Amino acid sequence: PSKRSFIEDLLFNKVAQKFNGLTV
Amino acid sequence: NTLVKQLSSNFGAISSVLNDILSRLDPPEAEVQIDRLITGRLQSLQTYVT
Amino acid sequence: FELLHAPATVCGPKKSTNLVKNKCVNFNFNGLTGTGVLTESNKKFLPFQQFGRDIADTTDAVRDPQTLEILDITPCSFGGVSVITPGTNTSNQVAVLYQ
Amino acid sequence: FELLHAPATVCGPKKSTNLVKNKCVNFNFNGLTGTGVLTESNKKFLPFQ
Amino acid sequence: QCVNLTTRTQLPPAYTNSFTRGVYYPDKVFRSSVLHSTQDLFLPFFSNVTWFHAIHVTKRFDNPVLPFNDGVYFASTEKSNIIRGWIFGTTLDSKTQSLLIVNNATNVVIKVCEFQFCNDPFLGVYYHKNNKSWMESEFRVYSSANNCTFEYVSQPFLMDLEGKQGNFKNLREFVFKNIDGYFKIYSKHTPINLVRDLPQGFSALEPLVDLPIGINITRFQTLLALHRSYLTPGDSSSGWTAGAAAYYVGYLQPRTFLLKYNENGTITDAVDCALDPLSETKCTLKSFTVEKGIYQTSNFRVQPTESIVRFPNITNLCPFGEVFNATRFASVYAWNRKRISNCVADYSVLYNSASFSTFKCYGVSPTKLNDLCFTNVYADSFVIRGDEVRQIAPGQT
Numbered sequence: 381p382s383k384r385s386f387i388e389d390l391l392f393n394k395v396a397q398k399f400n401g402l403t404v
Numbered sequence: 405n406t407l408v409k410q411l412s413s414n415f416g417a418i419s420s421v422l423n424d425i426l427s428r429l430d431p432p433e434a435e436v437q438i439d440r441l442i443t444g445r446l447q448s449l450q451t452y453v454t
Numbered sequence: 455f456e457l458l459h460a461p462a463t464v465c466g467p468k469k470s471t472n473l474v475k476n477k478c479v480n481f482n483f484n485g486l487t488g489t490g491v492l493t494e495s496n497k498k499f500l501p502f503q504q505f506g507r508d509i510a511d512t513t514d515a516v517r518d519p520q521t522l523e524i525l526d527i528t529p530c531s532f533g534g535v536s537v538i539t540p541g542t543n544t545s546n547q548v549a550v551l552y553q
Numbered sequence: 554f555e556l557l558h559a560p561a562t563v564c565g566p567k568k569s570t571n572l573v574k575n576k577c578v579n580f581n582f583n584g585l586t587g588t589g590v591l592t593e594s595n596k597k598f599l600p601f602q
Numbered sequence: 603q604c605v606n607l608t609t610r611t612q613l614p615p616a617y618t619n620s621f622t623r624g625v626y627y628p629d630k631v632f633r634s635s636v637l638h639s640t641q642d643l644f645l646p647f648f649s650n651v652t653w654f655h656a657i658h659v660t661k662r663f664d665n666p667v668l669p670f671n672d673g674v675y676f677a678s679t680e681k682s683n684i685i686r687g688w689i690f691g692t693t694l695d696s697k698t699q700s701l702l703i704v705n706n707a708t709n710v711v712i713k714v715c716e717f718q719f720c721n722d723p724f725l726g727v728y729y730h731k732n733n734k735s736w737m738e739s740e741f742r743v744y745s746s747a748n749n750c751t752f753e754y755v756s757q758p759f760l761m762d763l764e765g766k767q768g769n770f771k772n773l774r775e776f777v778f779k780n781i782d783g784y785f786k787i788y789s790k791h792t793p794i795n796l797v798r799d800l801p802q803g804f805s806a807l808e809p810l811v812d813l814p815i816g817i818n819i820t821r822f823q824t825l826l827a828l829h830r831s832y833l834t835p836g837d838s839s840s841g842w843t844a845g846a847a848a849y850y851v852g853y854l855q856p857r858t859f860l861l862k863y864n865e866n867g868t869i870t871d872a873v874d875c876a877l878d879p880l881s882e883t884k885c886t887l888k889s890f891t892v893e894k895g896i897y898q899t900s901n902f903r904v905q906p907t908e909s910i911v912r913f914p915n916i917t918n919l920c921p922f923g924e925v926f927n928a929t930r931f932a933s934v935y936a937w938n939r940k941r942i943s944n945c946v947a948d949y950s951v952l953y954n955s956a957s958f959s960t961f962k963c964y965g966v967s968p969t970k971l972n973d974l975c976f977t978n979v980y981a982d983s984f985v986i987r988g989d990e991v992r993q994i995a996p997g998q999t
Contacts, residue, residue: 396510399529400411403553412511423487427974428457430967456977457966462914464976467948471910480909485975489906519914533902537879541894548879553902559751559816560783599867601809602630 407448415444458485461504462519473518478530483516490527498524604720604742607838611661618653620645621800624675624852625859625872626777626788626807633863637888639875640861643673643779643854647874651852656684656826658844659767663826665722667694670822673779673854678824679794681770683763684847686725686827688778690785692820694719699751699817701785704825707738707763710756714815717744725827727763728836736763736829743825752815765829767846770794777807779854783816800850806869824849860885913975920945927956931983940981947976964996 382389398404412420417437419425425434455464462484478491484504495515499506508514515526534553572591579588624645654664670690678685687704694700696718703712706725726740764771777788788807826844834841860873875885882899883892920942932938949971952958961968986994993999 396508396512397408398532399512400408400510402407403534408510421488423489424458427485427487428966428970430969433967455979457974458977460977462975462977463916463943464945464947464979465913465916466946466972466974466976468911468913468972468975470913473912474908474910477908478904479906482909482911482913484913485977519912530904534898535900535902536896536898537883538896539880539883539892539894542880542884542891544894546880548883550879551896557816560814562814598632602627602632 407452410445410448413444415440417441470520473521475525481527483519486513486516488513488527489531490529492525493528495524495526605838606720606722607663607842609661609840610663612664613655613662615655615664616653617650618800618850620647620649620651620852621802622647622804622872623677623775623800624777624807624854625804625861625869627809627869628861632867633861634865634867636863638861638863639858639885639888641856641858644857644859645675645852646855646857647872647877649852651850653848653850654824655848656844657846659846661840663724663842663844665724665824665826667821667823668851670778670780670819671853672781672856673777674822675852675854676776676778676824676849677800677852678774678847678849679770679798679800680772680774680847682765682767682845682847683761684827684845685774685849686825688822688824689719689723690778690819690822692818694821694823696745696748699749699815701815701817701819702744704743707736707761709758710754712752712754712756712813713747713750714752714817715747715750717747719744723823723825725825726842727827727829729765729829729831731832736761739830752813754813765845769797773801775805775807777854778822780819783814785813785815785819787811787813798848804870804872824851858885860888916944916946918945920947922952922955925981925983926952928983931985934984934986937982937984940983942979942981947979948972960991 384392414420417425417440419428420441422438422441425437429437465485473492475492478489480487480489481492486505497515499515499517504517505513506515506517513527515524517523518525536551536553537548538551539548574591574593577588577590579586580591581587626644628640628642656662656664676688686706687702689700689702689704691700692698694717696716698716699714700717700719701712701714702717704710707727720742723743725738726742727736728739729736771793773792773794775788775790775792777786779786787810789810790805790807792805794801828842828844830836830841830843834843857877858875860875861869862871862873864870873884873890874881876882879899883897884890886899887897925940925942949961949968963971
């Protein structure tokens with residue numbers, strides 16, 4: 381489904397607060 | 405998580421929620437506790453941004 | 455007398471009102487006040503308890519002293535205001551962006 | 554001699570001194586305590602300021 | 603009460619729109635080639651104010667008593683000198699010190715006494731045929747004055763008092779404020795040339811004279827004038843002409859404008875800071891030319907509306923007969939502890955039974971007891987000597 385190779389898809393699996401003023 | 409633990413502290417007072425201190429102490433007398441909460445939070449902001 | 459150490463049983467000359475949901479109005483349960491939207495919560499508490507905290511040590515849900523139900527607290531203070539302008543030389547029109 | 558809530562407009566004349574220039578001395582104009590040199594200026598300000 | 607006018611055709615006032623007006627000097631600091639922004643009560647741009655008219659050529663003569671709020675912007679398009687003076691006060695019934703600022707044809711006398719105003723004060727002159735002088739005839743302003751607190755006499759002059767009908771000539775703009783009793787006056791005259799409405803552009807209100815008066819202005823009223831020629835009989839029925847002037851009554855609101863200082867030191871432009879999204883960016887970044895990019899302003903908050911309270915069913919009253927003012931309490935060493943719960947308690951019902959000489963609450967405000975919920979109330983009663991009450995305190999010995 382994504383435009384990535386088999387090596388790029390293998391390493392992707394390994395890798396309330398905003399209410400207090402911690403926006404992301 | 406460090407800034408989360410600082411909000412629950414009293415910083416020398418008896419409570420941490422601003423809606424609890426004003427409900428039991430009048431602003432003319434609660435000024436000695438609100439100033440400690442603001443100053444005690446400015447130290448965590450300067451440390452976090454550093 | 456103590457403050458916020460036992461369920462309400464004394465209180466004073468304060469009459470109770472109705473219960474409104476899906477609104478970001480103020481609330482008061484056993485002296486503890488706050489601001490948040492009272493919605494539904496699938497989690498249940500314990501019969502020998504009342505208040506409830508979380509990971510951030512905040513009041514997320516408080517048991518009602520009448521219906522004895524579970525209502526989650528969600529403050530509506532969540533959002534920001536932004537504006538993008540292409541410049542005062544091109545045109546005098548902007549676009550309000552919500553965070 | 555009465556003292557009420559009305560703004561008191563009867564005070565006392567303040568004693569004025571001289572004017573020293575080209576020296577780093579202390580001055581006090583309109584309650585503004587400052588220490589500097591009162592050098593001449595050519596530009597003008599506003600009559601109501 | 604007095605002698606007013608008859609057959610008055612009152613017309614409902616209309617609504618107008620401002621054109622960037624009501625910008626005065628917030629401070630007395632000279633600035634040049636530097637931008638400055640402060641918080642002060644100004645006039646919001648593109649606002650909706652009440653527009654009053656005085657057309658007669660019909661039969662209209664309206665002058666209500668509008669309340670005086672924090673800063674009132676007054677702009678009158680006087681074309682033939684119709685508006686004379688203004689009055690200020692609270693009740694206006696010879697009871698409080700009222701501010702009388704009237705601009706007659708002789709001297710600009712400003713007195714602060716206890717005048718007795720009628721239901722409709724105005725000025726009445728009679729224009730003769732042999733002479734062209736606009737002398738003062740009927741003077742229906744006040745009845746008498748007893749005690750006064752301020753007097754002022756201006757220089758003797760001769761007012762023109764024209765009577766040309768058609769287009770407007772002068773434009774008087776006054777800003778009546780009252781900050782801590784100090785009545786600020788900002789006068790600014792500018793000749794105009796149009797039919798009606800309000801001219802555009804930008805003006806600067808210059809101060810006149812400050813009069814420290816210790817009163818409390820609540821309401822005000824703008825007075826007019828009546829020009830009676832030789833053709834009118836001179837009675838108060840229909841022989842009166844109010845002209846065809848108009849005046850704007852606007853109230854100042856606490857806003858924030860970005861003042862502009864050029865090389866001369868005068869304000870020539872004003873930028874909003876909390877109104878339009880485009881004007882807010884120029885005031886936040888302090889720059890009139892904003893580059894093409896993305897910027898941030900304030901946050902987003904939703905203010906609450908209602909407030910519900912949920913307390914358990916407590917339909918019992920705590921007995922104050924055996925707890926307070928009983929027949930005999932215990933000593934200081936063998937004090938008795940009583941548990942009070944499952945009942946509604948209150949201290950405002952204790953002043954009628956016994957006058958408390960010392961009601962000090964430690965660790966809690968005494969006025970916040972009826973706003974919280976008591977928990978485990980223990981009654982610790984003991985009778986000691988009056989010289990030992992000061993020792994009973996959380997911190998003494």
